[PDB]
Ligand binder design. Structure first.
Ligand SMILES: N=C(N)NCCC[C@@H]1NC(=O)[C@@H](NC(=O)[C@@H](N)Cc2ccccc2)Cc2cn(c3ccccc23)CCCC[C@@]2(C(=O)N[C@@H](Cc3c[nH]c4ccccc34)C(=O)O)CCCN2C1=O
Ligand SMILES: N=C(N)NCCC[C@@H]1NC(=O)[C@@H](NC(=O)[C@@H](N)Cc2ccccc2)Cc2cn(c3ccccc23)CCCC[C@@]2(C(=O)N[C@@H](Cc3c[nH]c4ccccc34)C(=O)O)CCCN2C1=O
Lengths: 324, 322
């Protein structure tokens, strides 16, 4: 059993309009659905840099993406291994379909493997040499892939056919999220921009320009907010429509992953600086911080918000139990 | 400017044991500090055993070896009060409500009464070889002194005469606080005793597993906080059987002081730590690590400042930030 203890830090969360520190409301650090802390419960010794992590629904299995393979762990040694691509190249993203019987694996290879849960059901073949990020539509019919050439590939998962290729981003598309169904696509890139896309009419809506590259992004499940993890080490929380934005300074290096909890009240960000930071939506009050042994490359939160899994540069994954 | 950031620790606050589930106003609320910022260092040069702050806040009084130093906190002392002799420590110094008088107690049979060039107005002479703690009545007429022999001497400050000597403890009386009808005293006999000030007799007795070094009575009533030799802080209800046991010290809890609003309190240890706690279940508000043992503490009447006395032969002034 653990108990809260209040700390303070020099001003790290600012309102941008020029910067002014955020005066936190009383429900910033404590409230229903607000975690008190995160407790490490497992270490998954993958043995390769873990670039992608996904948690099963219901929570039982953890999928870790390393060099050439996906390892499946029973969190109640791997229970199985999924060989997807050349054992010299990294898996960059693996997404489960809502039901949980299908897994889509992307990486440093031209093909996306669709696994039945195990064997390869099908293989979508792209023109691009690599996939850096994947997103599945809430309806489980479409898959969005962020290509190395900056394009966004739109796949029809039923017929295993390409439907379209968005304008993307120049130099590479690094991250993706779907808008609370499911008409807007948000992508980030190495061209210092975040772009929104009309999924019904098929093309670009908005463009947010930044001073550095975007490595991660998340769309708030209760809507309104988009959280952006940058090369600069800053996290920016922008309103989709309003001009108000927050700038968060608790990372000392690149913000590599970002994930909102399903209730939308809080989110996590992970850095090259060994930190997993939990933040209050939207002004970024610091809920908890966990320091790891190496760079934290990827993260996932279970659909019930009870567990967090992180992928590490120390060639492992860590499972945390979120304590309320 | 500073912003709050939530942290967690393995269970350190228990209901007497079961860990305390904190309510939402435990770590955040009006009158609950966010943090404490060091603003001054007072280089006394002797271990600072007693610290008291003027009302209104302007001057801080630090008690060391045969010397009280006066500091204007608005880095060098503005004045010095030499308590003869210079070889013994000042254990307690309490100002009278107005602020023009200072009662100095310590490792000597006499209590000096200073007029505020400052001079010694009078000297109350006790039979005991030392005074470990002082408390002044709200009316400014009586002074209670905790003697080394375990007795509680009651002094009439106007006539400089002893009125009575309470049974005290079977061993030394180390600490004291006024409820202004009930006196609470702690001792080296592992007990906390309450005294009827109107009838002049002993009301209650709380028995502990180790010696009591410090104690405080919550200004809004109900709670008594006890700092112990075991390193534990215990918060006992005056009437109910419920009690809290706090474990954030690794060594003797040497001083303890409630904020005047009664919502929070501080405790200091031989372990170099200053801890701020939520009344009554002891949620950890802030912690400050010092360079040496923290022997004494005071909080200003407005709850804006904390002063601590250190084993590193100095005092530190903190500004409490809300
Ligand atoms: N050692 C092989 N086979 N992979 C290495 C690929 C490394 C990866 N960089 C590309 O994807 C880059 N692409 C490549 O390097 C290609 N050789 C991949 C490829 C191999 C084989 C076939 C086809 C393709 C493109 C890229 C460039 N940047 C990107 C940002 C996000 C997403 C993608 C990029 C700009 C900033 C790069 C810093 C960053 C970063 O900070 N990396 C971290 C974490 C990290 C450590 N090891 C990793 C392995 C894979 C992915 C990430 C990491 C670090 O070094 O601390 C950011 C996250 C990914 N990353 C990389 O350096
Ligand atoms: N050298 C001269 N002139 N003063 C020194 C007096 C030292 C003092 N000890 C008595 O009061 C003792 N009385 C005495 O020894 C002399 N007057 C004779 C009586 C005593 C004994 N104990 C007490 C607890 C509370 C109040 C009084 C006492 C129990 C064990 C001691 C713990 C404690 C403790 O742990 N103190 C720390 C911190 C400290 C360092 N120097 C100090 C001077 C005064 C008060 C505290 C300190 C320590 O000695 O390491 C607690 C605060 C006082 N203290 C002492 O050791």
């Amino acid at each position: 059993y653990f108990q809260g203890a209040m700390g303070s830090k020099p001003a790290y969360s600012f309102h941008v309009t020029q910067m002014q520190p955020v005066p936190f409301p009383p429900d910033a650090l404590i409230g229903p659905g607000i975690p008190r802390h995160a407790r490490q419960i497992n270490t998954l010794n993958h043995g390769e840099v873990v670039c992608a992590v996904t948690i099963s629904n219901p929570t039982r299995h953890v999928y870790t993406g390393g060099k050439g393979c996906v390892k499946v762990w029973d969190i109640s040694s791997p229970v199985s291994q999924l060989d997807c691509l050349n054992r010299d190249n990294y898996i960059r993203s693996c997404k489960l379909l809502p039901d949980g019987c299908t897994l889509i694996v992307g990486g440093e290879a031209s093909t996306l493997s669709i696994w039945d849960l195990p064997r390869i059901k099908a293989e979508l073949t792209s023109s691009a040499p690599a996939c850096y990020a994947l997103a599945i539509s809430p309806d489980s019919k479409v898959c969005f892939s962020c290509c190395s050439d900056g394009n966004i590939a739109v796949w029809d998962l039923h017929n295993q056919t390409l439907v379209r290729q968005f304008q993307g981003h120049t130099d590479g598309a690094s991250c993706i999220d779907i808008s609370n169904d499911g008409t807007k696509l948000w992508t980030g890139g190495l061209d210092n921009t975040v772009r929104s896309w009309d999924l019904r009419e098929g093309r670009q809506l908005q463009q947010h320009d930044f001073t550095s590259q975007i490595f991660s992004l998340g769309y708030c499940p209760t809507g309104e907010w988009l959280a952006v993890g940058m090369e600069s080490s800053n996290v920016e929380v922008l309103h989709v429509n309003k001009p108000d934005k927050y700038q968060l300074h608790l990372h000392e290096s690149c913000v590599l992953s970002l994930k909102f909890a399903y209730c939308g009240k809080w989110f996590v960000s992970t850095g090259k600086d060994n930190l997993l930071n939990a933040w209050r939506t939207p002004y970024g009050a610091s809920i908890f911080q966990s320091k790891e042994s190496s760079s934290v490359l990827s993260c996932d939160i279970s659909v019930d918000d009870k567990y967090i899994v992180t992928g590490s540069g120390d060639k492992k994954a860590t499972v945390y139990e979120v304590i309320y």
